[PDB]
Design a protein around this ligand. Structure first.
Ligand SMILES: COc1ccc2cc([C@H](C)C(=O)O)ccc2c1
Ligand SMILES: COc1ccc2cc([C@H](C)C(=O)O)ccc2c1
Ligand SMILES: COc1ccc2cc([C@H](C)C(=O)O)ccc2c1
Length: 583
């Protein structure tokens, strides 16, 4: 506690961010309330802050940020809690009142997807009022991604603003703007996932999990750093994400900026590469540190087996100080290994731990553990080959079929997962190919596995509240590190009773012709999940034949003049066709 937290935070981060952070905080709790309630609490909360800044003894100035946040939300029944799904929470005081709000964060609130207006419509909306425009935007992203790394979101606001400035006075708005914007959106969709996994890891496996994973990553990134300095960054980063993940976004943003200050302050003993982040303005600085390229591995690194197979004191260290020593290991194997994905290193360190567990209980531990590292080869080998195989098949099929290949895979693995979920995940899984195979072989594993780790996690967190498949609970619950293996290991389900031919899941309306080719794809891809759900022993060619025909229903019927009639004309004949081609 400061004497007035809200003031400290307000002076620390500044008005514009502070408004930013508070908008996001609110957007994130009450994701279902319309923009105007939000702006209301935001300004209400900014007013109180400016007030406190002014004189620290004003009323409410001593309350915790939660208390302030809470109170304001309960003159939000003043704007009818018609939903009010969590008016329950307002009933209790803290900390329950707050804990309660976090329970209700929803990872897929029932909202029309964030819609892209026409290049021109964006451009004007942006010309008219920057404030409102990016308010709405912060509002809209934050509420679909209730765990989105807040500070980065502000960053994305600042980038989206640069792109808008760029494109909104080109002779053609759209062509300047839509690629640059898709690009960035795909990137935000990744960051949202990354952060989601950090939170998931924190909340469901505990601080140690984010710690461990963090140490590994930074060890690869900052190979030259002593283990002391990597630990401090890890502990600071833990705090920031614990905070960010828990809605304490202001403290999180302060703590974050504090941490980047520290690294910049200490770049010499951390990394050469830091220079190019540390000159930058506040958010590009933290952004830049955040996805910085790995430094090169220091020269003169002793073999890893001196310290870990050969010290007489191997068991003495694992026994007397297990965290200290195993972090050391994750630090040392990791800094020596930018070519691995974090989760691979995590697994390795995990095998390294069981081996010592098993071997230090012997009369001869060394003789037991001596091969420990060589025995890593298999674990290094399993994903190595997998990637080569999958990128083979990516190269072969191309994005759309690579996604289809996975939809069909996945829907067979875990058919009880709801369709749009399966459609979503398989598209993202698909995305890995396009994302990583392009890199040269050695660069790929990290790219792939850690990307997969984010996507699989999206699957888990989607699957969590509305849990339907033992197979996914198991893989999601059992080990964070071994998730991907586990999902890869899944073959066809042997329990699922196949779905019935629902006339409508292959039915339509003129409206779907309003959907860009992209949305149209998801529609066929939903058709295809449905179809494997109907007949799972259906051949690829069979499946390809119906999806191909479904593709041909659209291609005729969204013709110049009348679209409505055809659907009703071929539609049922297109149903009939499909049942025919399958059996
Ligand atoms: C800085 O705190 C740590 C250090 C070492 C850890 C090792 C492990 C095992 C080896 C693992 O399952 O990765 C877990 C958490 C850890 C946290
Ligand atoms: C480099 O391309 C890949 C490699 C491994 C993958 C694994 C999976 C999931 C985990 C699976 O169940 O097979 C999906 C996509 C993949 C693409
Ligand atoms: C291992 O190569 C495959 C297997 C199954 C596939 C299924 C599909 C679906 C049926 C499709 O609608 O085309 C596509 C590509 C595929 C590639």
């Amino acid at each position: 506690a400061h004497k007035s937290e809200i003031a400290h935070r307000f002076n620390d981060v500044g008005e514009e961010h502070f408004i930013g952070l508070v908008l996001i905080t609110f957007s994130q709790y009450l994701q279902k309330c319309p923009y105007e309630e939000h702006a209301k609490l935001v300004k209400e909360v900014t007013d109180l802050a400016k007030a406190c800044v002014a004189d620290e003894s004003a009323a409410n100035c001593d309350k915790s940020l939660h208390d302030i946040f809470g109170d304001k939300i309960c003159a939000l029944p003043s704007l009818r809690d018609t939903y009010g799904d969590v008016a329950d929470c307002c009933e209790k005081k803290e900390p329950e009142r707050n804990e309660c709000f976090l329970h209700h964060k929803d990872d897929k609130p029932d909202l029309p997807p964030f819609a892209r207006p026409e290049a021109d419509v964006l451009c004007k909306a942006f010309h008219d009022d920057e404030k409102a425009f990016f308010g709405h935007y912060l509002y809209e992203v934050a509420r679909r991604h209730p765990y989105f790394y807040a500070p980065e979101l502000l960053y994305y606001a600042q980038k989206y603003k640069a792109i808008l400035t760029e494109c909104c006075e080109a002779a053609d708005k759209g062509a300047c703007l839509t690629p640059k914007l898709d690009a960035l959106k795909e990137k935000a969709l990744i960051s949202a996932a990354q952060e989601r996994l950090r939170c998931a890891s924190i909340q469901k496996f505990g601080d140690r999990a984010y710690k461990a994973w963090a140490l590994v990553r930074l060890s690869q990134r900052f190979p030259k750093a002593d283990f002391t300095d990597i630990s401090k960054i890890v502990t600071d980063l833990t705090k920031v994400h614990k905070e960010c993940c828990h809605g304490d976004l202001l403290e999180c943003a302060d703590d974050r900026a504090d941490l980047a200050k520290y690294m910049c302050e200490h770049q010499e003993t951390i990394s050469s590469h830091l220079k190019e982040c540390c000159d930058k303005p506040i958010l590009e600085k933290a952004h830049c540190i955040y996805g910085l390229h790995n430094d090169e591995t220091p020269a003169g690194l002793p073999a890893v087996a001196e310290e870990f197979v050969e010290d007489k004191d191997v068991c003495k260290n694992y026994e007397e100080a297990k965290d200290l020593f195993l972090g050391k290991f994750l630090y040392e194997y990791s800094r020596r290994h930018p070519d691995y994905s974090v989760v691979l290193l995590l697994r390795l360190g995990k095998a390294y731990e069981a081996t010592l567990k098993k071997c230090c209980a012997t009369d001869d531990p060394h003789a037991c553990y001596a091969k420990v590292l060589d025995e890593f080869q298999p674990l290094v080998d399993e994903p190595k080959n997998l990637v080569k195989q999958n990128c083979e098949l990516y190269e072969q099929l191309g994005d759309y079929n690579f996604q289809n290949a996975l939809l069909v895979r996945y829907t067979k693995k875990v058919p009880q997962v709801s369709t749009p979920t399966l459609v979503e995940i398989s598209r993202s899984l698909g995305k890995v190919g396009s994302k990583c195979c392009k890199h040269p072989e050695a660069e790929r594993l990290p790219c792939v596995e850690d990307y997969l780790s984010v996507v699989l996690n999206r699957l888990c967190v989607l699957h969590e509240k509305t849990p339907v498949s033992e197979k996914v609970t198991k893989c999601c619950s059992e080990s964070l590190v071994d998730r991907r293996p586990c999902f890869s290991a899944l073959g066809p389900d042997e329990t699922y009773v196949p779905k019935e031919f629902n006339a409508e899941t292959f039915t339509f309306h003129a409206d779907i012709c309003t959907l860009p080719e992209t949305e149209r794809k998801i529609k066929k891809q939903t058709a295809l999940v449905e179809l494997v759900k109907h007949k799972p022993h259906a051949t690829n060619d069979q499946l390809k034949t119906v999806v191909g025909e479904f593709t041909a229903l659209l291609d005729k019927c969204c013709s110049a003049e009348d679209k409505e009639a055809c659907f009703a004309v071929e539609g049922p004949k297109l149903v009939e066709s499909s049942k025919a081609t399958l059996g």
